[PDB]
Amino acid sequence: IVCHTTATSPISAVTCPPGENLCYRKMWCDVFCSSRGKVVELGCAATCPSKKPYEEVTCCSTDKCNPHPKQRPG
Amino acid sequence: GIVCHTTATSPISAVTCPPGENLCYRKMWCDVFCSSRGKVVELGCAATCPSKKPYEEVTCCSTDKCNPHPKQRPG
Amino acid sequence: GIVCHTTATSPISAVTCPPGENLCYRKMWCDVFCSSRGKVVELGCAATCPSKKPYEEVTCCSTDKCNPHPKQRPG
Amino acid sequence: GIVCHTTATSPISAVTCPPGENLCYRKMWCDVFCSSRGKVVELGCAATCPSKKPYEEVTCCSTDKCNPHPKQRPG
Amino acid sequence: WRYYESSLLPYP
Amino acid sequence: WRYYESSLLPYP
Amino acid sequence: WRYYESSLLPYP
Amino acid sequence: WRYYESSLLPYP
């Protein structure tokens, strides 16, 4: 599966290693949440990442289904 | 840390290299399509400069984004 | 690449491992105070699992923060 | 992520380890044919280092292709 | 780097 | 993905 | 730092 | 597959 990743600048798409067949978006507030919004983390995963109490996690299994909120999926 | 171009993404993007990996590398070599497309291009991070094999061509450097794809501007 | 607890810092923290050391280890053994404090605890990064003497305790793992101090939970 | 030699294939090859198994291991022990063929060789991926019997030989490492069959050098 | 939903540009 | 010096677009 | 199983605080 | 230190060929 191909997935968006926040590990690069600018955001780009990476092919996930074998056995990692989901994309994930993870969002949470940091100190600047009032002005900039929630932190965004995008990547690959085998199992959907477990959500910490303050986090928001979305997992999906189609190519590039985890875009940065300011961009189109696919 | 050092920022380096990487071919692991599409399109090519820049990644921050992990601790202790303070060099960028470009590695180029001919595959079957070298006559029509030129050499394969691989860009990434490294701790030690890759050892130059006889058939590969390697560039190593220690400034951010110093290893661009030949078709773009470094930095 | 892997993050792991190390006894090199105070308090114990999780650190990014140097290049080439991509597994964690916990090593425990009795010292002079084993009756009152329990076994010595040593945590860190490594390339190879340490060779464990019969009385030593070595457990090796390769996921982030998988080598916690006995008074903490992995993950 | 990590590639490791595996004895599950024929001939032995280097495979990408499943998610969560990020170290290589080699395990050797004598069977009935140990006098003529030498020790059994078992290679694969693992999350944790396998627990070693006193008569077994277990090696754990976390670099690519670091667990070759004795008739091959690492890397 | 660090991204936020407000922009596609990274922070530190 | 595999790149070549002739283009910034990947192939496989 | 030398640690022991009994506490997260070092003893050396 | 069963392998042995003496050869790269499997024996089962």
Numbering used by the authors:
A (entry chain E): 1 to 74
B (entry chain G), C (entry chain B), D (entry chain A): 0 to 74
E (entry chain F), F (entry chain H), G (entry chain D), H (entry chain C): 1 to 12
Article, verbatim:
Three-finger proteins (TFPs) are a class of proteins (peptides) including TFNs and their mammalian homologue that show similar three-finger structure as TFNs. The three-finger neurotoxins (TFNs) are a collection of such toxin peptides used by the snake to kill the prey through binding and blocking ion channels in the neurological system. The α-neurotoxin binds to and block the muscle type nicotinic acetylcholine receptor (α12β1γ(ε)δ nAChR) on the neuromuscular junction, leading to paralysis of the prey. We introduce a working pipeline for expression, purification and validation of disulfide-bond rich three-finger proteins using E. coli as the expression host.
We previously reported the production of bioactive recombinant α-Bungarotoxin (rec-αBtx), in which we used radioimmunoassay to determine the optimal refolding conditions. To test the binding specificities of the rTFPs, HAP peptide, a known peptide derived from the nicotinic acetylcholine receptor, was mixed with various rTFPs and separated on a 15% native PAGE gel at pH 5.0. HAP peptide was only able to shift rec-αBtx and only slightly shift rec-Hannalgesin, but not rec-MTα, rec-mPate B, rec-κBtx, rec-Mambalgin-1 and rec-hSlurp1. We compared the elution volume of rec-αBtx, rec-κBtx, rec-mPate B in gel filtration column (Superdex 75 10 300 GL, GE Healthcare), and found that rec-αBtx, which were known as a monomer, eluted much later than rec-κBtx, suggesting rec-κBtx was not a monomer, which is in accordance with earlier reports that κBtx exists in dimeric form and also with the solved crystal structures, while rec-mPate B elute at similar volume as rec-κBtx, suggesting rec-mPate B was also a dimmer. Six rTFPs’ structures were solved with x-ray crystal diffraction data using molecular replacement with known homologous structures. From the structural alignment of the solved structures with their native counterparts (such as rec-aBtx-HAP complex, rec-αCTX, rec-kBtx, rec-mambalgin) or with their most homologous native counterparts (such as rec-Hannalgesin and rec-MTα, whose crystal structures were not reported, known homologous TFPs with known structure, such as αCTX and MT1, respectively, were used as the alignment counterpart). Through extensive biochemical assays and structural analysis, we showed that our rTFPs were almost identical to their native counterparts. Though it was generally considered very difficult to obtain rTFPs using either E. coli or other expression systems, with our pipeline, we could repeatedly obtain over one hundred mg of rec-MTα, rec-Hannalgesin, rec-αCTX and rec-mPate B, tens of milligrams of rec-mambalgin-1, Slurp1 and milligrams of rec-kBtx and rec-αBtx through one round of experiment (usually finished within 4 ~ 5 weeks).
